[PDB]
Design a protein around this ligand. Sequence first.
Ligand SMILES: Nc1cccc(-c2cnco2)c1
Length: 164
Amino acid sequence: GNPLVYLDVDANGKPLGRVVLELKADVVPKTAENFRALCTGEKGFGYKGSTFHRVIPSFMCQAGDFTNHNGTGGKSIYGSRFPDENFTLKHVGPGVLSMANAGPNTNGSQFFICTIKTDWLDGKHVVFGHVIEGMDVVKKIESFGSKSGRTSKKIVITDCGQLS
Ligand SMILES: Nc1cccc(-c2cnco2)c1
């Protein structure tokens, strides 16, 4: 079946708990595979130790810049960037997992978890999964955001990997 992966998240060095994500490899296999491998770290790099660097309440929590930790970096398991696989899955509500980008076909490792329906991102960002468990953790992360995206606590993915 589709991969299940996890992110364990700290805020200022204290654990918030675990976010479990289903990756929709049935719809976006290349995008799912990238995220899965970045969670396990099996290519020699990935999300472990990186941060949620941009969090905006009533919008989304963004992470995955494990090279620059500020929204300018990250890389995929294929190369620095890879194409938009498809836009078949939509930003239907809170819990949607989607790829951040810098325009068409600039997927790397940065991703976001929506805390609302973000319908205006349909056809622009590749949705590739959703939150199975840990929306409470996502809401905590969200609460440490701001209008500018600047976080008020240091939000770190302390551990991550594959459950199935
Ligand atoms: N992959 C990805 C996602 C979001 C932003 C960027 C980005 C920005 N400046 C250089 O790269 C890259």
